[PDB]
């Protein structure tokens, strides 16, 4: 059949769109009839005309990245590195719009290397998921909660949970009542990915084998905002979300001078009553920070993370002071508590972000050593963060 | 000729070969030279991008864009492009269109419009930056800071200051209307005049940093929560028990309750300053990378609280709100200046500058932004209640 | 003891026609002779109520001015509550030397408070300043649809509208004068924060006198408009708010002093270097990991406490009235000295009304010489009282945090 | 002579210096006066005839005399099948009437009900490595099972109370912010918890000599400031009631309906103080009774920062959905019944009348729990009336 012909049946039988991938064959022609039924749907038809769609592998987003696909959009890719970081050296790839971005981070790279590099660790590592369950009465919930804090309640609560994956290990519990509902935090690590899926279903197994010991509870909701994901939360500040890591670096008084245009008391003087002491006034939970937010933002979307997890994988504590001999080097630490990221699944899948993902020799699956490439991804995020504190702070305190 | 130029768009000729180079260049740097194969970069339009949107470009990164609508929304209809890796995520947004469809549209309204800067200055003594901070709040004090702000810029107007005073530090937050522009860059230029005025006025006053946390961008604070950033904006809608019924899946009372102790008792129990809604993010997000937003501005952009409530002659029918009072946004510069994500804007009609009313394009995009956000509340919170 | 139907004098007999006509104990002092003999009834009749009839042995009762009391500050009375009070002082502020009374029962805090005014004498004393002077009052009210309450958020927002509603809300009091509206819509429905004045009252009561009649006037542009509850939380009175950080509420004050490093040395027992790595580390880092939104001090709710007490404040206002941030640099020529300052944007205090009538407070009061109405200039006592607070409090936080710095 | 002792002196020492406490607190008051604008006006600030004995060097210093605080009382209040006749000390004006009826309503609907969820005080001090990869290292030596028995039996030998339980540590660079968490018997636990954290540093200094002791109390604790950490993993004791008010008694006692209060309190409790940025006040005015009840039993009033934290749910219940579910969860109430100001004659009297004063001999920590859970139930009393008293109007 023709173009005009499929636009005719699908017009002529009230037959919804999108369901265009299971009736043609090819991709690529699905998408260019349902650009073709929604430009009749504009008051500007020739709107859709610079939308790239072509030349696009729609085979690995189909079923699994996106729905009513009518093109994709390109964003500019820039590098910035060498980031020197535990003694290894990085070519950041950043997905972004903002100009000067990538050049003021690389300016930060560039400090770090010429001061000897960086160094960082993952202090924890584990997703979460927090329903929310109700019983009859606060002293039920009450018992529940007693229950769940014992080692047999756990152990079993642990077997149900972690029989869904091989890579779903509970690792503990944190519960919390508000009366008659319990909010059940429950946290594992899940190899490479960044998890969600994994711990959805071992939290429903968990929450239907902890039905059989208390028939009465009711699952509300198998996500009461406990976790907490993508909205601002206290809770991800201090227990941690997904990876918590800490990177530092000592830049050298003639390198502040030199490549940042500042000194090291005027970073510190700027870092104080802006990262710490605005973002105090301000009533900040989680943001005493100048922009880490763009960079991991920039990461996010060149190597298919989930950019609206930016929300809470941004929390960071940017801390600065005298240093050295004679107390004008620089010492800087990024501190970031929860870190949502995953070198396998949802847009890591795709080629485009696969190939980001290599450039830094993490892509897919860690065989040996499960878990490592989502570590080695979250430490370089965090290491970028400071390349680009650095910069950007210097610029400010520099004027 | 590709070789002997390692031994760039400011030298070379093409655009396009710049980036060539430079992937080659950086392709010896790498553990695995091949990774950049799969990585695009041909037939791109790097002219827009060149000097504007980024540097030591090596290709581009492709996001699946989805449609989903139409949303109805104040008597209209918007088809909304979504740029997203999240399988489903268009397909409920979807389906919370079609429940508000169903249910005769959405009504929204902007509250306010005024993106802000947050510089720190000091004084030699909180004696001093009081008196600062007294004159500041001067009708006349105001009036020269406001003349020499918005001598800056045809389309920057200071609306209102806060100072906040911590001992000899003062947190000045301007906030001033931009257009159809975000607003950065514009109020970031009229901040340093005024700054620089207020020096004339206070010799001995330091500045030290043209932001200091106190605006609030792209970290989360109360401060943008309480007293807005950017646009401020409230929609609405109901939906018919049969519609929640059949297109939802679920009930109206099943939805309420869901909304209070995740929405409101969850989000409380978590110790959360605006995230009062289930996934506001998601739909910030998608729209935003589509549309040649600052991405990262989804921290506070994605504030919200939703709120739902029994309607109806019997209490039947599902009522629904969305308040954002921090939607960072605009449809003029930075990223909504290439081609394909003006491709996106003008499938919504609010490309570019409002040329009559500068601004109303922008806050037209904020408004369909918040609907969107609202179609998607609806859509997982009825997938959540149902199970 | 007597028959009920005589019974027309007898401690045994009151109880007896108590229980018989099951009349309530709080209406003792309304049918008793002496206020006093009224309470020592309620405390009887309570007494053989308790699994331990005994207990009320050593609380305190007679000898009390409960005239002052009664229908005024405490219901179903049963004596009093005796709070140790101590004095800190000379605090040296502003060019005038005060005598700080403290009520509290915490060992070493007086002390402690008292070392640290020490240090700023020393110093040349203290400096402080009002910022701004307003209390709240958020009321909640609903429209039938967002678009309405947007209407009338709107509408508060002309020059025409709050003048009728400034006009409404000053009309209930010669100290009331609205200074400014902060609104916040959630949907339906609005959250309006009325600021005003009260003169040298905390003024809760005047503020919400002028809330109630500000909102019929509103609901006569708006008919619609339900009036859910005078408060709505949005003030906010007495739990932690971001609000009242950002916006003030009550008395925003700020104080400061530089402590000479001999004195940090000598009086405090360490280094001003010492002092501010702890300040940083402790103060800002600290709350910050700890998620606080306005506790950027080590315990400003001591002072507050033990202040407000002693002068008849209303102590559960300590929630919000201990907001602080307290900060320190190195100062002088050789940078050798401690600059401190102490940031309160929500002192909620008062010098008339609610507990400062009652003698033994207004004593306290005086002590500091700001009791009662100012009559020249009304709400300078409030005032004051504001910035000893905040003076006090940096006193309290130079020798804790030197404390903290020097041992361990 | 009083003249004479005032010459000599032309000092804080007059109770060492004399003899009598009285004379002493009298003497300083004469001193006192001379430096006052206006001299006479300690005239009605009343110090005659009260055991100073308690009181100095272990209370309150410089003491010029004593404070009364009217103290009402309010009940009784059914809870957990017992009854409570709660003392309450104030100065606002009908306070405790309004406590008192909300008492009212939860006896007449069958009783409250209230369970203890946790109990431990903290402290969390602040140290310093010299790097935050030697921070880390400490942050993982502390997770290990081998590491913590070590730090626990340090903690647990500098008292008969002191049983470290969890330890939650964070990392701000090279900065290690460590909270201990222990019971502590009776007592509110600050000054137990402070000695066992002490040598616990120090043992663990032992096993890390470079590490700096930057201050016993980082802020993490946290106390007396709010903090989210102290709202998410409690503090002292997590408490919650709950209570159903039958329609008949919401309609004739707190003069309202079920559904008129279910809709004040979503609307201020929950979307008021969420616009209001607020970090643990759902609540109307818990802080009201936690400080009443604080004053009048002699604890730390101070504490009512975090104490007061509070989350109030109600709902409609039963057959027709016209009856008041309500709960109150308190999870921070810093409290105690042995030590500070419960060792004073009036607050053990006022202890007494709960039936909770001092150490509980068969089982420690009993009798905090107890009035832990009286504090949370007359809160919940306390937000009942008011909460009505707004439905109403
Ligand atoms: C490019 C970017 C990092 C930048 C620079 C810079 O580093 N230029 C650069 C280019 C090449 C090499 C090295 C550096 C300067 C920047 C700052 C000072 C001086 C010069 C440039 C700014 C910027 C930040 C706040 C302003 F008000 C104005 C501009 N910005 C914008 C950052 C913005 O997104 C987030 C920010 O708003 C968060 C905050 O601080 O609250
Ligand atoms: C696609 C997406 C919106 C979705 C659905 C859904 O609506 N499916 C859909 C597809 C087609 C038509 C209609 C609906 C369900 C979803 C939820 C319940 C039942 C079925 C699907 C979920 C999801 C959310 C939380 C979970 F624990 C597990 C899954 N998710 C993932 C949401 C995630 O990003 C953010 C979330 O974590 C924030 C939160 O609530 O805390
Ligand atoms: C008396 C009090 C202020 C005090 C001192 C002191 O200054 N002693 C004093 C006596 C005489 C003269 C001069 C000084 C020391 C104190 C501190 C260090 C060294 C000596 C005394 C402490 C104290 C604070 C935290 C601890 F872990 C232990 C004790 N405390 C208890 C304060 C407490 O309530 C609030 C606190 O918990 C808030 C915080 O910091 O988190
Ligand atoms: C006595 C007190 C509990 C009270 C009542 C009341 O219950 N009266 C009472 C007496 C006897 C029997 C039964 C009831 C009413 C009250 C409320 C409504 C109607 C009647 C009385 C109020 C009060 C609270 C906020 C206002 F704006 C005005 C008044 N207040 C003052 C409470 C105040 O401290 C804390 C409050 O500000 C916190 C908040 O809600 O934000
Ligand atoms: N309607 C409009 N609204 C805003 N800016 C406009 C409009 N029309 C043209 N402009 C131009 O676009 C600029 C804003 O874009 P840009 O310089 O990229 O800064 P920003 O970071 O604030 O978006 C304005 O300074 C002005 O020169
Ligand atoms: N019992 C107390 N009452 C009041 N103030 C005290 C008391 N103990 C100490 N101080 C305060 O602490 C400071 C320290 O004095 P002191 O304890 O005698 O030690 P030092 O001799 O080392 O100065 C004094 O300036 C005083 O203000
Ligand atoms: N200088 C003054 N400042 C404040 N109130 C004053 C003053 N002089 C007299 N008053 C009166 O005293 C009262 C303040 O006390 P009160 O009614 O208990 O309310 P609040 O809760 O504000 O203390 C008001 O009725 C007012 O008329
Ligand atoms: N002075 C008071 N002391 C104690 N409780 C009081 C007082 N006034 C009112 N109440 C409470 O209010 C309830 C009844 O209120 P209401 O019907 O207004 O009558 P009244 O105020 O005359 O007692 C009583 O059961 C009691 O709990
Ligand atoms: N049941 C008990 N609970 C608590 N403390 C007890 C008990 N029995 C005896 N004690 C003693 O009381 C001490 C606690 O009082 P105190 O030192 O004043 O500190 P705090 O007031 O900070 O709790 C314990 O160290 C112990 O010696």
Redesign the interface.
């Known amino acids: 059949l023709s173009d005009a012909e499929i636009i005719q049946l699908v017009n002529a039988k009230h037959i919804p769109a ?1 369901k265009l991938e299971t009736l043609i064959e090819t991709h690529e022609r699905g998408v260019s009839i ?1 650009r073709q039924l ?1 430009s009749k ?4 038809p020739s ?6 769609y072509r030349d ?1 592998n729609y085979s690995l ?1 189909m ?18 590195g ?1 980031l020197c970081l535990d003694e290894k ?1 990085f ?1 950041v ?11 003021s981070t ?1 300016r930060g790279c560039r400090a770090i290397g010429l001061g000897g590099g960086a ?1 960082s ?1 993952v ?1 924890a590592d584990g997703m979460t998921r ?1 329903p ?1 369950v ?1 019983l009859p ?3 039920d ?2 018992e529940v ?1 007693a229950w769940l804090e014992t080692s047999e309640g756990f152990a079993v609560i642990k077997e149900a949970f972690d029989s869904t994956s091989r890579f779903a290990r509970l690792q503990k519990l944190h519960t ?6 319990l ?1 059940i935090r429950f946290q594992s690590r899940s190899g490479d990915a960044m998890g969600m899926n994994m711990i959805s279903k071992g939290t429903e197994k968990a929450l239907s084998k902890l039905h059989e010991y208390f028939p009465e509870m009711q ?17 991800n ?3 941690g979300r997904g990876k ?1 890591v ?3 670096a000592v830049i050298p008084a003639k390198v502040v001078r030199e490549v940042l245009k500042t000194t090291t008391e005027a970073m510190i ?2 870092n ?23 960079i ?3 990461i996010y ?2 190597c ?1 993370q ?6 809470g994988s ?2 960071c ?1 940017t ?1 600065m002071e005298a240093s050295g001999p004679t107390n004008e080097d620089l ?1 800087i ?3 970031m ?1 929860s870190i949502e990221i995953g070198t396998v699944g ?2 890591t899948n ?7 993902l ?2 830094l ?1 993490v ?1 897919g699956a860690c065989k040996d050593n499960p878990g490592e490439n989502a570590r080695q991804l979250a430490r370089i995020v965090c290491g970028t963060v400071m390349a680009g504190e650095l910069s950007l702070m210097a610029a ?2 520099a ?1």
């Open positions: 999108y349902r929604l749907k504009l008051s500007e709107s859709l005309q610079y939308l790239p696009y987003v079923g699994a990245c996106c729905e009513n696909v009518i093109g994709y959009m390109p964003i500019p890719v820039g590098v910035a060498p050296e070519q790839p950043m997905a972004t719009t903002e100009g000067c971005l990538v050049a690389n160094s660790r202090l927090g929310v109700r009465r606060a002293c919930s009450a909660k919390s009542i508000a009366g008659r509902n909010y699952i509300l909701a198998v996500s009461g905002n406990y976790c907490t994901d993508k909205k601002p939360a206290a809770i500040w201090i227990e918590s800490v990177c530092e003087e700027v104080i009553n802006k990262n710490l002491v605005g973002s105090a006034m301000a009533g900040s939970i989680g943001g005493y920070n100048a922009h880490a937010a763009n991991v933002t920039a979307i060149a298919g989930d950019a609206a997890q930016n929300v941004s929390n504590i801390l010492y630490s990024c501190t508590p949802g847009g795709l080629l485009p972000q696969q190939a980001c290599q450039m020799g892509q400010l305190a004027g």
